[PDB]
Design an enzyme around this catalytic site. Sequence first.
Site, PDB file in Angstrom:
ATOM      1  N   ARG A  30     -27.570  56.186 -31.693  1.00 49.66           N
ATOM      2  CA  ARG A  30     -26.536  56.580 -32.637  1.00 49.66           C
ATOM      3  C   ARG A  30     -26.035  58.023 -32.450  1.00 49.66           C
ATOM      4  O   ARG A  30     -26.830  58.978 -32.367  1.00 49.66           O
ATOM      5  CB  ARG A  30     -27.105  56.473 -34.052  1.00 49.66           C
ATOM      6  CG  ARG A  30     -26.064  56.559 -35.145  1.00 49.66           C
ATOM      7  CD  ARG A  30     -26.663  56.529 -36.578  1.00 49.66           C
ATOM      8  NE  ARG A  30     -27.436  57.740 -36.845  1.00 49.66           N
ATOM      9  CZ  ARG A  30     -28.471  57.831 -37.663  1.00 49.66           C
ATOM     10  NH1 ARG A  30     -28.903  56.778 -38.332  1.00 49.66           N
ATOM     11  NH2 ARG A  30     -29.087  58.987 -37.808  1.00 49.66           N
ATOM     12  N   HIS A  58     -26.402  50.934 -48.168  1.00 45.88           N
ATOM     13  CA  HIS A  58     -26.245  52.376 -48.357  1.00 45.88           C
ATOM     14  C   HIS A  58     -25.037  52.879 -47.620  1.00 45.88           C
ATOM     15  O   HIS A  58     -24.512  52.217 -46.704  1.00 45.88           O
ATOM     16  CB  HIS A  58     -27.514  53.115 -47.882  1.00 45.88           C
ATOM     17  CG  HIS A  58     -27.755  52.995 -46.402  1.00 45.88           C
ATOM     18  ND1 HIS A  58     -28.198  51.835 -45.812  1.00 45.88           N
ATOM     19  CD2 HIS A  58     -27.544  53.869 -45.389  1.00 45.88           C
ATOM     20  CE1 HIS A  58     -28.270  52.005 -44.504  1.00 45.88           C
ATOM     21  NE2 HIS A  58     -27.895  53.238 -44.219  1.00 45.88           N
TER      22      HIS A  58
HETATM   23  O1  AKG Z   1     -30.015  49.904 -37.696  1.00 43.74           O
HETATM   24  C1  AKG Z   1     -28.784  49.589 -38.032  1.00 43.74           C
HETATM   25  O2  AKG Z   1     -28.277  48.562 -37.590  1.00 43.74           O
HETATM   26  C2  AKG Z   1     -28.065  50.525 -38.980  1.00 43.74           C
HETATM   27  C3  AKG Z   1     -29.091  51.616 -39.306  1.00 43.74           C
HETATM   28  C4  AKG Z   1     -28.382  52.623 -40.161  1.00 43.74           C
HETATM   29  O3  AKG Z   1     -28.246  52.474 -41.354  1.00 43.74           O
HETATM   30  C5  AKG Z   1     -27.743  53.856 -39.511  1.00 43.74           C
HETATM   31  O4  AKG Z   1     -27.875  54.044 -38.322  1.00 43.74           O
HETATM   32  O5  AKG Z   1     -27.031  54.686 -40.250  1.00 43.74           O
HETATM   33 FE   FE2 Z   2     -27.275  53.886 -42.195  1.00 46.19          FE
END
Ligand code: AKG
Ligand code: FE2
Length: 253
Positions: A232, A86
């Site tokens: 994040r 995605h």
């Molecule tokens: O958990 C990950 O390594 C990526 C997860 C993800 O798609 C995001 O944080 O946008």
């Molecule tokens: Fe993601």
Amino acid sequence: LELDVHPVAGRIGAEIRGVKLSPDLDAATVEAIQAALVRHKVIFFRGQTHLDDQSQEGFAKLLGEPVPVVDGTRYLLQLDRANSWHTDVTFVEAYPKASILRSVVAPASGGDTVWANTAAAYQELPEPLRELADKLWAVHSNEVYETEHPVVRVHPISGERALQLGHFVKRIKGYSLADSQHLFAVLQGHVTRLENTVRWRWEAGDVAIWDNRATQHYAVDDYGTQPRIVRRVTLAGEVPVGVDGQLSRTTRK
Ligand SMILES: O=C(O)CCC(=O)C(=O)O
Ligand SMILES: [Fe+2]
């Protein structure tokens, strides 16, 4: 300024060494990071053990504007399973331009993330198929948002064209279901072709930054009940511009 940059896979991904991420990085370092990001699509910094929640958030603000959060940050999201290809949040019009993701707890085996270069995927299409992709629009949805994006986005900094597809795509506008499925499968199949991807095995203190305008990614769900914790920050992005200068637009709620 030339950073110490080590490409990971042949067509995407680079590790940057000798940089300690922080809110206090100088302008040259930030600019060279931004350039490495546009060029390599996803970049990696290892051993960022000093980066804590506030410091990650302050570093992120140097790169753009951050969009239930980790205590006490304003913008820092904890994730502890995106095993689908995605591009983040494409069901909205102005989806994020980048994320900065730090590994807090990393499974001893498994737990990788894979990124795909959607600009390389576009460029490798035979010309008549690029020309077709230049004309298509898709409906992206979270099903409650629906947005129509061009299938080909002209990157606002590099000018490189990139495929805009992924899991949130509901259908290609103007085609039957069956045709939509075949056309999606062709173009998305170029995105995830192994040659266009890089896979990162995380260690605690690893930080990845990816250009969400020219990638997709996939979190590998092979680690069972081994704990995996990442944090994040997401940066605000622009409205996509298609090859003919047309703009994405939201069509539902
Ligand atoms: O958990 C990950 O390594 C990526 C997860 C993800 O798609 C995001 O944080 O946008
Ligand atoms: Fe993601």
